[PDB]
């Protein structure tokens, strides 16, 4: 099954601009959800669900772009007034888990808070639209807004660029969609035939998502794909501390600033709590190779190589 599987309908190729805010808050659309699945083991933190959404071809999509989901109720900070849209990455490409054009997925970590002193959960507090969208079953009726964003759309112009894509939990969903759409799909308008290098960080081997579908594409794809996991809870850095993206990161640091300067693309998605870190590598990395990191990072939203949706 080496062989690309079928997509349909081409004319989704067509489009000359990503389509934006088709759907607004005022009059969002109703899509049905087809399926809901838990993508972790019991050893997770947290429970990260995968949702089908049918949206039946009304609100298509490019990979990269976020839906938005206004949960039902009432905003608890504006009485009478719908809740407020949260947005979520599409992790699909704009065919869809079922080849046909007809659905998205999203993959949602289910947010809840547990009191730090008694170490209870505590439903009053918990996320309103992650736990909405994870409680979900087939034939659940869902508000759909968008798509939006602009960021992390796919640079197809060479297609035989580097893409390297770093991700922490659920920002791993974009990248899913552009995996697919590489390796996995028939587009014969876009053959891939450079490099994606794909850096997941998460818990635990419990808390690895979508890890069978990234491995196939090590075995087909050997010479055009690389993937590299971090389990913090797991693995220890080269100093007995817990094992970060960032850490990997500086493993291969010379081979990664040997694509930059090579005009790679490099993305990060997920908690914005992992750029700190980040940053203060590739600061110290820029500055062994005699560069200032500040100038070259300013090069690099020059060259349009810095794509970052953290949040
Ligand atoms: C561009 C973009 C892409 C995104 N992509 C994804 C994605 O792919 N997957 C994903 O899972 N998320 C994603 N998010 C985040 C998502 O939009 C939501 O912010 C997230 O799901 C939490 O929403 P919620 O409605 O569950 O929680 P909310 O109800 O908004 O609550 C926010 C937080 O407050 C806590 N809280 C509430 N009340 C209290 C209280 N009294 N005391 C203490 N804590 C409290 C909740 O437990 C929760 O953690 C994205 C965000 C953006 C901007």
């Not at 099954?1 to 808050?25: D, F, G, I």
């Not at 010379?254 to 998605?269: N, P, Q, R, S, V």
Request: glycine share 10%.
């Amino acid at each position: 099954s080496r062989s690309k599987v079928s997509v349909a309908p081409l004319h989704l190729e067509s489009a000359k601009e990503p389509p934006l805010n088709t759907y607004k808050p005022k009059e969002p659309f109703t899509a049905t959800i087809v399926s809901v699945e838990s993508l972790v083991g019991p050893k997770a933190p947290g429970e990260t669900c995968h949702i089908v959404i049918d949206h039946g071809g009304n609100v298509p999509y490019w990979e990269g772009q976020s839906y938005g989901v206004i949960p039902p109720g009432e905003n608890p900070k504006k009485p009478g007034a719908p809740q407020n849209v949260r947005l979520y990455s599409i992790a699909s490409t704009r065919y869809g888990d079922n080849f046909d054009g007809r659905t998205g997925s999203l993959c949602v970590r289910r947010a809840v808070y547990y009191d730090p002193e008694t170490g209870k959960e505590d439903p009053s507090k918990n996320g309103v639209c992650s736990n909405f969208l994870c409680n979900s079953k087939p034939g659940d009726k869902i508000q759909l807004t968008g798509p939006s964003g602009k960021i992390m759309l796919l640079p197809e112009e060479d297609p035989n660029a580097t893409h390297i894509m770093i991700a922490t939990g659920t920002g791993v969903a974009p990248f899913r969609g552009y995996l697919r759409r590489m390796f996995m799909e028939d587009v014969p308008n876009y053959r891939f035939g450079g490099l994606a290098w794909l850096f997941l960080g998460v818990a635990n081997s419990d808390s690895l998502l979508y890890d069978e579908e990234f491995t196939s594409y090590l075995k087909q794809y050997p010479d055009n794909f690389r993937y590299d996991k971090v389990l913090s809870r797991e693995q220890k850095n080269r100093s007995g501390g817990k094992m970060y993206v960032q850490d990997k990161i500086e493993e291969y640091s010379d081979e990664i600033f040997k694509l930059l300067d090579g005009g790679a693309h490099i993305y990060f998605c997920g908690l914005k709590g992992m750029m700190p870190g980040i940053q203060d590598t590739l600061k110290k990395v820029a500055e062994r190779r005699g560069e200032s990191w500040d100038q070259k990072l300013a090069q690099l939203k020059k060259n349009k190589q810095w794509h970052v949706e953290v949040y």
